[PDB]
Amino acid sequence: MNTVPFTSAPIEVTIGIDQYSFNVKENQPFHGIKDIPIGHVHVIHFQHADNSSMRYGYWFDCRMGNFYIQYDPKDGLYKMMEERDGAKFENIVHNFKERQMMVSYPKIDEDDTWYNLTEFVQMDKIRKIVRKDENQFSYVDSSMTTVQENELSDPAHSLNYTVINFKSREAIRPGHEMEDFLDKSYYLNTVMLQGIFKNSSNYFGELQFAFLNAMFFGNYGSSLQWHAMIELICSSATVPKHMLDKLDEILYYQIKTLPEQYSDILLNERVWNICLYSSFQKNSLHNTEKIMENKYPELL
Amino acid sequence: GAMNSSNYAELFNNDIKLFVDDTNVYRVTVHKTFEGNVATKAINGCIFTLNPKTGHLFLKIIHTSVWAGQKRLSQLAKWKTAEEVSALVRSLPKEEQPKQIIVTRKAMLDPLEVHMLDFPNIAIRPTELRLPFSAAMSIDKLSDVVMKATEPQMVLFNIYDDWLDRISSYTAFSRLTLLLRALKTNEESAKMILLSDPTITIKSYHLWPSFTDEQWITIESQMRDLILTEYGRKYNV
Numbered sequence: 001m002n003t004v005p006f007t008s009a010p011i012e013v014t015i016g017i018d019q020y021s022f023n024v025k026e027n028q029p030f031h032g033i034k035d036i037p038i039g040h041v042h043v044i045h046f047q048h049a050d051n052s053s054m055r056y057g058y059w060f061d062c063r064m065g066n067f068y069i070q071y072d073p074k075d076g077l078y079k080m081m082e083e084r085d086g087a088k089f090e091n092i093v094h095n096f097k098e099r100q101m102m103v104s105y106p107k108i109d110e111d112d113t114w115y116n117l118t119e120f121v122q123m124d125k126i127r128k129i130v131r132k133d134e135n136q137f138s139y140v141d142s143s144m145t146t147v148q149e150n151e152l153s154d155p156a157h158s159l160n161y162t163v164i165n166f167k168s169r170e171a172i173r174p175g176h177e178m179e180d181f182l183d184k185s186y187y188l189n190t191v192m193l194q195g196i197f198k199n200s201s202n203y204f205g206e207l208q209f210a211f212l213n214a215m216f217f218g219n220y221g222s223s224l225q226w227h228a229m230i231e232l233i234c235s236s237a238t239v240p241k242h243m244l245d246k247l248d249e250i251l252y253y254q255i256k257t258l259p260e261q262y263s264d265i266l267l268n269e270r271v272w273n274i275c276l277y278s279s280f281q282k283n284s285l286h287n288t289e290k291i292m293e294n295k296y297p298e299l300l
Numbered sequence: 301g302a303m304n305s306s307n308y309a310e311l312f313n314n315d316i317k318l319f320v321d322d323t324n325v326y327r328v329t330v331h332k333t334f335e336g337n338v339a340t341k342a343i344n345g346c347i348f349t350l351n352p353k354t355g356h357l358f359l360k361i362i363h364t365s366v367w368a369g370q371k372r373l374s375q376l377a378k379w380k381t382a383e384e385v386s387a388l389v390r391s392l393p394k395e396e397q398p399k400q401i402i403v404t405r406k407a408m409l410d411p412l413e414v415h416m417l418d419f420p421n422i423a424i425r426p427t428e429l430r431l432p433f434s435a436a437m438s439i440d441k442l443s444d445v446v447m448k449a450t451e452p453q454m455v456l457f458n459i460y461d462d463w464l465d466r467i468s469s470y471t472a473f474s475r476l477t478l479l480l481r482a483l484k485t486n487e488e489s490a491k492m493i494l495l496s497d498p499t500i501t502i503k504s505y506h507l508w509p510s511f512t513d514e515q516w517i518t519i520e521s522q523m524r525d526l527i528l529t530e531y532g533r534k535y536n537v
């Protein structure tokens with residue numbers, strides 16, 4: 001079990017770790033989060049009590065270093081940093097635990113939610129979507145735009161998701177215009193899976209990461225990307241059987257975890273109704289269709 | 301954006317543009333079978349591709365053989381249209397290629413966009429106008445070349461005959477759309493109007509009769525009256 005200590009909490013802030021969150025008051029004696037499960041990426045995220053504008057946060061993996069949080073009063077935010085002196089870090093953590101100034105990552109033992117949301121998400125792949133190579137952790141916020149968004153303006157602060165565009169030469173083979181537009185299997189299997197992602201696990205990891213940034217930061221281009229990656233599979237007549245089964249599990253847990261009051265903005269009516277009821281794969285997402293109908297029948 | 305009443309004069313500026321109408325591409329008669337089921341028999345069709353500034357009509361005849369063994373023909377018909385329009389553009393010299401293609405039905409937008417991906421600078425536009433180009437098969441010489449075709453064929457016509465020697469393109473297009481609206485609302489009456497006088501002939505190289513300027517004003521009045529009436533007989537007013 002790993003720990004992310006906090007130097008202090010000088011401003012009132014709601015702190016999230018994965019799907020958990022807690023309120024910390026201005027100058028409350030808060031010194032971090034302990035008992036964080038090893039083996040998964042994690043995200044620690046912030047919403048200041050004053051300016052609910054800009055949710056922001058950090059993706060990290062505790063196996064890749066010792067990370068802590070420190071408020072910067074010049075830039076006005078909680079920053080993640082790496083401590084390279086390992087003895088300095090154990091001593092800090094051990095003192096803060098001894099004084100019991102840390103919250104415990106509150107996982108229920110039966111609960112596989114976080115694993116299920118991050119099954120294919122790898123820190124190495126996150127760092128290619130979020131380019132900041134001097135850090136082992138990745139900053140994301142509500143306002144960052146995607147590469148595809150910038151094509152339709154700061155490149156260093158962009159989310160470099162894989163561009164998917166159904167009316168593009170990459171998607172459409174010359175002389176197969178109608179075939180490839182109505183059945184996207186070529187684009188999914190050859191262009192994207194074989195060509196770009198190499199395997200379905202990297203595809204799913206990007207899809208899961210886009211969902212999580214949409215959910216935790218309200219990042220709009222991330223939501224567009226998550227829906228595009230669903231629609232590309234659902235609009236392919238020929239999908240490996242293992243991918244469809246895993247997609248049904250992936251989406252099931254995403255829909256299960258979404259806050260009910262945010263379904264109005266995070267869920268695209270056209271994609272979901274097309275995917276569940278019109279597409280080639282309309283009959284292949286049994287778990288997802290059942291939870292969607294019982295939880296968001298209005299959308300449909 | 302879409303073409304509508306408000307930006308109507310853009311059709312007659314000097315940027316090359318084409319209207320594409322696909323309403324006569326896939327044409328069928330519905331009939332009963334010996335077992336008393338219903339079946340379709342396709343007949344020859346056409347793509348109606350028109351330069352509204354010049355009167356140039358690229359009439360691509362769609363022979364029934366193109367449907368043989370195919371499924372979902374109404375859907376294929378929009379993609380076949382887009383393939384043939386794209387092939388036409390590619391066949392034209394660069395300085396004759398359109399800068400915009402306006403489709404008369406919105407379901408053509410995606411098929412044409414996908415077929416024209418090689419031409420990113422050609423704008424594909426819908427229209428809010430309810431243009432009467434479906435009535436082109438009520439023009440006798442156009443209907444005649446479609447029905448006689450034994451193979452795929454492109455046939456070229458000026459749909460304005462020689463009108464542009466005497467009138468502007470705006471006025472020529474208004475005349476054309478009036479004639480075609482009349483033919484669509486009441487074909488028999490419209491054709492009676494155009495031919496009632498035997499002394500006015502259609503030149504061998506023309507589609508419409510050789511009316512004088514005065515006779516066109518009378519003709520145009522008669523077609524207006526028809527369209528109001530048939531709107532009477534239809535809405536009882």
Ligand SMILES: Nc1cccc(CN2CCC(O)CC2)c1
Binds near residue numbers: 355358359456457
């Ligand atoms: N659609 C189209 C394209 C180019 C030119 C013309 C004019 N053309 C039609 C009649 C032929 O006897 C020769 C003249 C029409």
